[PDB]
Structure 1
Amino acid sequence: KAVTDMDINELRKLMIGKAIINSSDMQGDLLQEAQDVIQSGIENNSAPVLNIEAACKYIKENLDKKFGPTWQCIIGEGYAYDVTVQNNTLLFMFYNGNLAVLIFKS
């Protein structure tokens, strides 16, 4: 039982609300506001089949009003990127399963 009983397919099915943060470069108080908004927005726009474009459009509009005029966030199953951002303007957190989310302020 426990970890041995658990399987990758089983783990994904068992928990869909688990939140994992891989890279943090933004102030913690700012991260708390951003994390609550992104999780709520993705679930609302997830629909029958998750849309990468749909999730980004909702996140981009919310972030621009929330902090600064030019805010760019990209979410993909797998990607390699080099990004130049302002100090404490980049937060990296990936959702449980094959979902990687990158949000930064330019």
Structure 2
Amino acid sequence: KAVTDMDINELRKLMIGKAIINSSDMQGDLLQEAQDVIQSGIENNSAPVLNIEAACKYIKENLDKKFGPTWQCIIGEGYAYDVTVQNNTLLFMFYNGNLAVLIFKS
């Protein structure tokens, strides 16, 4: 039982609300506001089949009003990127399963 009983397919099915943060470069108080908004927005726009474009459009509009005029966030199953951002303007957190989310302020 426990970890041995658990399987990758089983783990994904068992928990869909688990939140994992891989890279943090933004102030913690700012991260708390951003994390609550992104999780709520993705679930609302997830629909029958998750849309990468749909999730980004909702996140981009919310972030621009929330902090600064030019805010760029990209979410993909797998990607390699080099990004130049302002100090404490980049937060990297990936959702449980094959979902990687990158949000930064330019």
TM over 0.5: yes
Give the TM-score, by structure 1 length: 1.00
**Structure 1 residue 103: deviation in Å?**
0.0
Indicate the SS of the match to 2:83. strand
Gaps of 5+ in 2: none
CA root-mean-square deviation? 0.0
Once the two structures are superposed, residues 35-89 of structure 1 have per-residue CA deviations (whole angstroms, 9 ceiling, x without a partner) of 0000000000000000000000000000000000000000000000000000000
Separation (CA, whole Å) in 1 of partners of 2:78 and 2:55 = 16
Separation (CA, whole Å) in 2 of partners of 1:90 and 1:34 = 11
Q: Hey, what does 1:42 align to over in structure 2?
A: 42
Gaps of 5+ in 1: none
Q: Hey, what does 1:9 align to over in structure 2?
A: 9
Equivalent residues, number: 106
Indicate the SS of the match to 1:93. strand
Separation (CA, whole Å) in 2 of partners of 1:58 and 1:75 = 12
Separation (CA, whole Å) in 1 of partners of 2:72 and 2:29 = 20
Q: Hey, what does 2:95 align to over in structure 1?
A: 95
Structure 1 residue ranges (4+ consecutive) displaced by more than 6 angstroms after TM superposition: none
Separation (CA, whole Å) in 1 of partners of 2:24 and 2:80 = 17
Q: Percent identity?
A: 100
